[PDB]
Amino acid sequence: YNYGGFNLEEPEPPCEDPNTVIFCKGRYYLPVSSSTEGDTYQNLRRVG
């Protein structure tokens, strides 16, 4: 999207706190992720 050096991308939405705890079924649950993962955003932004 940086075309002629023109950004054109939306800003990245706000983050989530890493400490709030969740329960659904078993023990208590804390979010975690990879830094680099694949989605529709990453499958696009290649075509653009």
């Binding site: 990879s34 680099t36 993962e37 694949g38 989605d39």
Partner: protein
């Protein structure tokens, strides 16, 4: 100073989808001629 037999490792990354429903193409190593309808194949899954 290599291994004592042909060997090769591949490192790959995972995709993401919140509910789970998947799209892939059967990649082809072939050029497709003009004006000939072609029926490349796509596989999927879908979650509850």
């Amino acid at each position: 100073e290599g291994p004592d037999f042909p060997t090769a490792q591949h490192f790959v990354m995972r995709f993401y989808s919140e509910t789970g429903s998947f799209l892939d193409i059967q990649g082809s190593s072939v050029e497709l001629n003009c004006g000939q309808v072609h029926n490349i194949s796509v596989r999927y899954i879908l979650s509850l």
